[PDB]
Amino acid sequence: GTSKLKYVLQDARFFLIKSNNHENVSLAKAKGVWSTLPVNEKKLNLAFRSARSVILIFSVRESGKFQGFARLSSESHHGGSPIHWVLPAGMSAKMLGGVFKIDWICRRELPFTKSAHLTNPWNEHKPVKIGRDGQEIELECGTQLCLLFPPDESIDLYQVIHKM
Numbered sequence: 001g002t003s004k005l006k007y008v009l010q011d012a013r014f015f016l017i018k019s020n021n022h023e024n025v026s027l028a029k030a031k032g033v034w035s036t037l038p039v040n041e042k043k044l045n046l047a048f049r050s051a052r053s054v055i056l057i058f059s060v061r062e063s064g065k066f067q068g069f070a071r072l073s074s075e076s077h078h079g080g081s082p083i084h085w086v087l088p089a090g091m092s093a094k095m096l097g098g099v100f101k102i103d104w105i106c107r108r109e110l111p112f113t114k115s116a117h118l119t120n121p122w123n124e125h126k127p128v129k130i131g132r133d134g135q136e137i138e139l140e141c142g143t144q145l146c147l148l149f150p151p152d153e154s155i156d157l158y159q160v161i162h163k164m
């Protein structure tokens with residue numbers, strides 16, 4: 001069903017994640033972690049304090065798809081086990097040192113062809129598939145893009161609902 005999903009998405013904030021590789025999204029799906037550059041780290045730390053839910057919607061560059069979406073369950077932290085990211089060119093471990101804990105809500109893919117009717121008022125009304133890493137997605141466009149994903153029946157949102 002979609003009832004607990006809508007409950008999670010109520011008054012949430014949505015951020016677009018553009019990973020440069022599939023490997024790190026894979027790693028993020030396994031370990032429930034994500035790291036971004038300092039500029040977006042600050043943005044997500046600020047958003048986590050400000051909304052009942054901060055939703056990250058993932059898309060690997062040049063895949064033509066979103067790969068799922070997840071909920072921030074913490075602010076970033078530095079000093080844990082060095083998460084073996086496939087560092088992208090121009091990025092160092094120090095830059096990606098801030099680690100957000102996340103609870104996945106859907107690990108299923110959604111092809112861009114299916115979100116062509118959705119545009120983002122915070123990105124000049126461009127199709128929601130278009131945007132840099134960190135682009136915030138406006139409440140209604142974000143909500144509807146999430147509802148477009150196939151249900152991920154392996155996930156039980158009771159766990160995520162209580163942290164709210």
Ligand SMILES: CNc1ncnc2ccsc12
Nearest residue numbers: 018019020024035036037
């Ligand atoms: C784990 N962090 C990342 N992995 C792959 N691509 C990007 C782009 C900005 S952060 C990031």
